[PDB]
């Protein structure tokens, strides 16, 4: 097997689409191996740029094709370069730009942590014909910077693993295992936008639905509470436009459902209090003493959720 030393430089990470759980990575990939010694012009390394490597490949040069595994579509390669040394080592440098994909877990959606994963693998050569010795990832242009709502924390984690493929077992009986490189870059979401944009107005709506209990007439207590309840119900598909149609509820979705239950319980309570007015003149005080307890119960539920979930 040949020892291929890979260096990946990440130019920028952009286009993080959480609706499709994809992201776009820009940068250069440098793959280095050693072959037979050759004669170059002078005693200087020879640089073979793009649309000239194919002449060397037709002449008989061994340049392996390294593919990215977790891409959607195909990586849009740009300029590519081949460097040949008189001592006999070949360096393949190319620029990639592809839409990678990774599984994302949105339980704690405003305060969420995922990672961006690049997976590299030879297309045709197994570990008995091509081995990855090591990878150094040079991530300093995005080391501590803020992609539009994501913070990059820590350095990139590298790993080399061998992946066994059973669809190549018929064509390769005992040698169908492929060397792989995984590069993981941790990202932490910035919750500031949601804090000033969705939690702040919805908190004020729920505060108004708390303060409707202080009114002295049934019609004002009823129609304004219905208006606020329908306003909170109108926020149902807020998450589904940012994220996908996930089968689970986030913090924001749970807060919206808590708003549903709060204002619906308020409506049911005031309707029951009006129904208990059998003669139209009896007024209840114990069932209307909840003007402080009901927001206190909401805050208790909120703080228990904050303590337990985080």
């Amino acid at each position: 097997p040949v020892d291929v030393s890979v260096s990946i430089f990440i130019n920028k990470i952009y286009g993080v689409n959480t609706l499709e759980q994809t992201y776009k990575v820009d940068g250069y990939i440098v793959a280095q191996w050693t072959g037979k010694p050759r004669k170059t012009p002078g005693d200087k390394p020879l640089i073979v740029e793009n649309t000239q490597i194919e002449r060397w490949i037709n002449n008989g040069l061994w340049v392996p094709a390294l593919e990215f595994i977790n891409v959607v579509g195909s990586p849009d390669t740009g300029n590519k370069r081949l460097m040949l040394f008189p001592d006999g080592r070949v360096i393949y440098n190319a620029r990639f730009l592809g839409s990678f994909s990774n599984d994302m877990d949105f339980r704690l959606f405003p305060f969420d942590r995922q990672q961006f994963v690049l997976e590299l693998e030879p297309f045709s050569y197994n570990n008995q014909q091509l081995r990855f010795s090591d990878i150094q990832v040079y991530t300093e242009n995005i080391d501590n910077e803020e992609i539009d709502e994501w913070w990059i924390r820590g350095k990139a984690s590298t790993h080399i693993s061998d992946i066994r493929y059973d669809h190549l077992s018929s064509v390769q009986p005992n040698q169908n295992e492929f060397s792989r490189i995984t590069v993981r870059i941790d990202a932490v979401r910035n919750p500031s936008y949601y804090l000033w944009s969705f939690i702040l107005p919805l908190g004020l709506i729920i505060a108004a639905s708390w303060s409707v209990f202080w009114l002295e007439s049934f019609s004002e207590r009823l129609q304004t509470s219905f208006t606020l309840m329908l306003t909170v119900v109108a926020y149902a598909f807020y998450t589904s436009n940012i994220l996908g149609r996930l089968p689970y509820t986030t913090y924001i979705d749970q807060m919206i459902i808590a708003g549903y239950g709060s204002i619906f319980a308020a409506i049911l309570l005031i309707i029951f209090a009006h129904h208990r007015q059998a003669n139209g003149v009896e007024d209840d005080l114990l069932i209307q003493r909840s003007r402080l307890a009901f927001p206190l119960g909401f805050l208790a539920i909120g703080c228990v959720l904050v303590i337990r979930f985080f």
Copy 2:
């Protein structure tokens, strides 16, 4: 005819667009046949990577082109490989990525079952010149996993059939029949999102439209019922943004229409009860005793629909 043995490995399934009834399938296709014996470097199989197969094709190698039938657009192939054996068998390995299409049936839309179908066929060779012997599909990366709202259940079903084409009857008189491979992967939709996102708020809206009957004034019974009816009518195009403009009603569409009929019948009933107040003082009790029967009728209709339809 030549015996071509196909192995399809499914990398991932993503981008299931039910509005256009398309989906994207990633993976590799391995096609193997046997030809004449040849001389390779040493006694080892020879690997011919991409942009080098065309040299062998120009030299006179027979590499058939297998196309995908049910794609929209063209499949975006990536790296492709050719493996030549000294015993005389040729293996064509390539990576595909295309937007396939299949007919989908959305009667039971939240609790729906479709399948993802890959159809493979030679472009130019009939069954008298190219036969498909067998296909083994290796589907373990998506075996029991959850695509964004779909569950993959069971193993992939394979079938080999011969398809007769009448547009090739003039150019091929008695031999216009083509061998085909169909790969079917069953998928079951996850109804959790709709259960907590659309059925839960709409159920509470219909519960409020039930509870409006307990009010003691006509204006409160009228304007709140009109507001809830218009709120339910505003949910008319909810399905048409997820699915297409289907000619049939789903479970969700039938529930929305049931909400229409429920709140409209409530409005008609309270208007008729107000109109029967000829002197402005007579109050009706039999026509207003439906405060428990009307939700009971709605629940009876719902449970009969659940029992009969499922």
Copy 3:
């Protein structure tokens, strides 16, 4: 001139975008002509697949280029095949996939009839150098099936016509006329979706705006009528999202405008009836006897429109 016999097989029709009046057609095109006799391997027809026809074209084979006239963008061709016979006839088979365009006429929009037109023409050869003898269209995969809201009725109509071009008159003095093939496939829209999705809720809204006349108070007659009128006005851009910004009104647009006029005339009538209450106690009966006539007038206008327009 050479006699070119064309056979077009339609695989599927999809992506009917009425906003841009385009549609996507999949299938294969088979063009057959006769040339000089040639020697093939054995006495069997020779199949030349893709990226190998150019070798024969460089050697001196005459393969004309047939273009599609009414496409938007360029047709995304896939595999293409060339078949050569020892008797001396050449068959060019290729797969096309393009976004065709045709003029559409949306007067009777829910109950609408357009056709899908494929226009084929040589790019460079006039009728004195290339003639189309006949075309047989093989349309059985979409013969009687339902594209998402369209029904295919009847068989495809074929026509061969000669088209004269005046921009080639300077470069070709008396021979600037080009043979053409037009393939027309009739389509009938399914009105079921609009019937259960837009006509059914809007009919109930107009029925409520009819039933507001039975109320015994001016404020209830006024604010609910204003709410229903604004609800109907909110449906103004419903057609412009499905179709384009057409200069004419459809059935649905005319029904929406009839809703405008109905509820606005109701508002004007109740305001005039309130204004005639000079002393605040006189009640009018003749001007409020229209509770049955006004929906009867709406139904009369509707049935006259249905009889005359259809």
Copy 4:
């Protein structure tokens, strides 16, 4: 310099996107010049189709590259043809399809007039090496027809001008001037859709806000006026979805702002009239005699704007 005679045939104009001020033009371009006499097969002109012109260019044929200046992206060329005459004239015919761009001026937006401009220029040859003699534009497929909301009026205007480039002054000292062709096709917008779709409902909303003054109670005069004012305010971004975010107001935007001012002045006037009721029983007649003057003032402002602006 060589004399190049250009003929442009416009197939169709489609996709007029006023949000980005681009449009798509389909058609063929015929460029004719004269060179040295040559020998063709027989005494007949020789037609060289696509992917065969490059052989003649490698052999030493001078085929200049004409580029389009005002395109966004690159023009998607289709089939291209080369015609060679024994007398020694070369004709280059090709089909283009590109997204052109032009500056648009939306002051009189419903009744607006722009033009579609095609600009053609050699890429590398100045006026001392390539001159454009004349252009004839053959525009009969779109001569008097209606693109989706645009009317083509008059014939296309042609102009030949020389454009001087200062970025080529260092590489070409005294000869950096390039011949150009501009083709202008006037277009007039159809205002029918906006007339029946936006002016008609907004006119009825403003008429209702006029008729609210006839009500005899302050609450009905206030809440309905607020509802209509908020309805008119909701139409603020109607233009920004059709056109761009233009720094100027159109006719429709000015009508919406006039609706703002009208209903806000009505609200201020009724609030001031209620505030002048110091004892709660005094009624004002002079300040409420504006029920005919205020719509008369609105109509006077409208007719002065119509007379002066048009």
Copy 5:
């Protein structure tokens, strides 16, 4: 090292997408260096157009590849030209069209200033093998013109810097530093559209929420204030559709939050004033004397923000 003199001509700047912080730049790039003297046809410079430079590169011509650093995707190059002089200087002229990217800072969003940055760099040659001598940018087509909401002010600023890459340190031990060109074009946003489209209606909404204090009844003061507060809350995601989901508040976002606080404080104040009516007849004057102070406080906050922030 070779001295490469670059001239960049900017044709147009369009498609400024502030949601993704990208923009599209059209124009031509002229790169000039000097090599060995050569023989041309005659004593005239030789122009080598596109798809003919590769013949010279295969023959052994040194044409370096200059890439753009800050692009998203790949630049869509069009025609490219090579000019060879008998004195021995090579000029590479090409047309580029790419979607560049730059960091944007939206604190003062309506009155905002960013710049458009083009970064050019060799792909494979360091400063010891290729130096950039100078760049002249010819920006007269966009010198003082208005891109759709941006004004170009001043002339373009040019800079030449050397960039050190640590991912090439293993393959190039002491020479891994690359020469770069940065071209900066200042842009100033036009705030007119937002001034007449969002600040003008929202200012009138806040003025109405000021004027609700003059009403003499609690229900009119309450329901209209709630309607205006919900209307202002509905404007929460106005910025997120133009810009991104930024973690900071702009001028418009701060004005919307000030509207939240203003109308919520008005609602709390009127509810507290109603609650202080213990007997239902006592009226407060000091707490309702704020009808002039509360808008005065809002204007004071606004003018302090205008003075301090600007």
